[PDB]
C-alpha positions as semicolon CSV with decimal commas, in nm:
position;residue;x (nm);y (nm);z (nm)
1;X;0,000;0,000;0,000
2;X;0,105;0,369;-0,046
3;X;0,285;0,551;0,233
4;X;0,273;0,923;0,294
5;X;0,483;1,144;0,069
6;X;0,853;1,161;0,163
7;X;1,158;1,354;0,031
8;X;1,283;1,203;-0,294
9;X;0,938;1,095;-0,416
10;X;0,878;1,175;-0,787
11;X;0,549;1,331;-0,894
12;X;0,364;1,537;-1,140
13;X;0,260;1,845;-0,942
14;X;-0,045;2,056;-1,035
15;X;-0,066;2,433;-1,005
16;X;-0,343;2,662;-1,129
17;X;-0,287;2,763;-1,490
18;X;-0,010;2,513;-1,549
19;X;-0,011;2,158;-1,691
20;X;0,070;1,874;-1,446
21;X;0,443;1,932;-1,405
22;X;0,741;1,693;-1,346
23;X;0,858;1,749;-0,989
24;X;1,000;1,593;-0,673
25;X;0,935;1,623;-0,301
26;X;1,236;1,805;-0,166
27;X;1,413;1,788;0,168
28;X;1,426;2,098;0,383
29;X;1,791;2,193;0,443
30;X;1,903;2,287;0,794
31;X;1,823;2,657;0,846
32;X;1,582;2,674;0,554
33;X;1,226;2,811;0,557
34;X;0,987;2,526;0,645
35;X;0,661;2,472;0,449
36;X;0,321;2,552;0,604
37;X;0,137;2,268;0,787
38;X;0,017;1,983;0,564
39;X;0,228;2,125;0,275
40;X;0,534;1,976;0,110
41;X;0,825;2,157;-0,062
42;X;0,796;2,074;-0,429
43;X;1,085;2,122;-0,664
44;X;0,977;2,162;-1,023
45;X;1,206;2,007;-1,281
46;X;1,314;2,220;-1,575
47;X;1,212;2,553;-1,417
48;X;1,395;2,464;-1,095
49;X;1,129;2,655;-0,900
50;X;0,989;2,558;-0,558
51;X;0,631;2,588;-0,437
52;X;0,449;2,445;-0,136
53;X;0,170;2,203;-0,226
54;X;-0,052;1,956;-0,049
55;X;-0,124;1,594;-0,160
56;X;-0,433;1,690;-0,360
57;X;-0,196;1,847;-0,619
58;X;0,060;1,560;-0,614
59;X;0,032;1,265;-0,856
60;X;0,289;0,980;-0,818
61;X;0,510;0,977;-1,125
62;X;0,509;0,603;-1,205
63;X;0,126;0,582;-1,210
64;X;0,082;0,915;-1,398
65;X;0,365;0,936;-1,653
66;X;0,167;0,774;-1,935
67;X;-0,086;1,056;-1,907
68;X;0,122;1,358;-1,809
69;X;0,469;1,278;-1,942
70;X;0,432;1,420;-2,295
71;X;0,608;1,729;-2,440
72;X;0,456;2,069;-2,371
73;X;0,516;2,415;-2,511
74;X;0,558;2,575;-2,168
75;X;0,899;2,717;-2,071
76;X;1,111;2,457;-1,898
77;X;0,873;2,167;-1,936
78;X;1,064;1,940;-2,179
79;X;1,385;2,005;-1,986
80;X;1,186;1,895;-1,680
81;X;1,081;1,572;-1,851
82;X;1,445;1,489;-1,919
83;X;1,546;1,559;-1,560
84;X;1,273;1,349;-1,398
85;X;1,356;1,047;-1,624
86;X;1,735;1,076;-1,634
87;X;1,865;1,239;-1,312
88;X;1,570;1,306;-1,076
89;X;1,782;1,313;-0,758
90;X;2,062;1,546;-0,870
91;X;2,149;1,887;-0,730
92;X;1,998;2,150;-0,965
93;X;2,119;2,440;-0,747
């Protein structure tokens, strides 16, 4: 059975106005700003942006890739597809 989301989990993450986006659950570094309650720090592949999202907006990548893992015109998206398939756990800092 599924567990709760944990750092390193791969997802498509949904934000208003944007297609379901390749992303990971990030760790919070020592001394870094923590997310709000019930929110997770989401790192978006390709754009390398971070937002805080709850589980309703998080789709596990393995289950969802056949539907959401297709090229998209939006800035950074196809880069993001490469990253989530080929080096999803790298430092993109």
